[PDB]
Amino acid sequence: PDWVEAQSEYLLLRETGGTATQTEGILERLRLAGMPEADIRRLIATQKIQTR
Amino acid sequence: TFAQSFPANVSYNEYQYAIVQARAAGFIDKVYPLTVGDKVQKGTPLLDLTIPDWVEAQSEYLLLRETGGTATQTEGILERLRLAGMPEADIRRLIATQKIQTR
């Protein structure tokens, strides 16, 4: 579950057409949180919150 | 008159002793070819790790640098970094790159 809060926050900034400088910052807060760089690529590729 | 042979053993110098613990929690990025038994030398790479403990404060620094805060306000956030555990050598790579340090 840990990573979900920040994932959704990223997905709604994709909705509210946020800046690259703003969105990238949240992807980085995930890498540091321990999420797999691949499991992140999977996030962007489907705009879907990874849970399992 | 005496003449006795006492048995002895060769051992490691216990004044040349070092245990390498991580300053703060994190995960391992990669680990170099090195296992128990190998002969290493001062400077030999052990492992690369990512630590997100200090990141928040490093921003509190870069921020201070964009608004040109006080020199005493900068030494503050800075010495709080060395107090947090961040290595004096890795700090020089924060001021020099002007980018946060993670790995």
UniProtKB/Swiss-Prot annotation, chain A:
The chain holds residues 156 to 207 of 407 of the full protein. Induction: Transcriptionally regulated by CusR in response to copper and silver ions. The cus efflux system is composed of CusA, CusB, CusC and CusF. Part of a cation efflux system that mediates resistance to copper and silver. Belongs to the membrane fusion protein (MFP) (TC 8.A.1) family. It comes from Escherichia coli (strain K12). This is Cation efflux system protein CusB. The gene is cusB. The cus system plays an important role in copper tolerance under anaerobic growth and, under extreme copper stress, in aerobic growth. Coiled coil: none annotated.
